[PDB]
Amino acid sequence: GLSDGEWQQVLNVWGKVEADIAGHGQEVLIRLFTGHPETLEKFDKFKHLKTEAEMKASEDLKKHGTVVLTALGGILKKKGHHEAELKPLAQSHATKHKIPIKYLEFISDAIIHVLHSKHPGDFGADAQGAMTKALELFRNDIAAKYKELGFQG
């Protein structure tokens, strides 16, 4: 798993996220949607947004970004014993929304990009590697649950 020092670096940069969860959420989603427009098709209420300008001005989108990063934060803070926080997310993403693991990879990259962009001083080489492992563990445990839930995934 991750070392205590790796989790410290994950939690340190997540500190920066929580100081402005909305702005971070908004930037992560925008990065995801602009990098991987197919992901936007999964969002009934957002997929009419054609441009970055439109995405930035969307309050719905910023609200959802907060929702996403709030749930992820709760998982990250559990540092590897996150079963309980992970369970309802795997559940909804496997039945209600059907989010392929590949899309979770895209959003992981989007998060790492935004974190490197906004907080390079709190997100150097070791920390980027620790966050990489952290998000990998998230996707890995989501996948394991997807399997039980009958979604591939």
Residues 102-118 as b or e (16 or more Cβ within 10 Å = b): ebbebbbbbbbebbbeb
The full length of the chain comes to: 153
3-state secondary structure of 78: coil
Q: How was this structure determined?
A: X-ray
113 marked among binding-site residues: no
How far apart are the C-alpha atoms of 42 and 37, rounded to whole Å? 10
How far apart are the C-alpha atoms of 56 and 65, rounded to whole Å? 11
Domains of the chain (ranges plus CATH)?
Answer: 1-153 (1.10.490.10)
64 marked among binding-site residues: yes
Resolution (A): 2.2
How far apart are the C-alpha atoms of 48 and 116, rounded to whole Å? 29
How far apart are the C-alpha atoms of 143 and 141, rounded to whole Å? 5
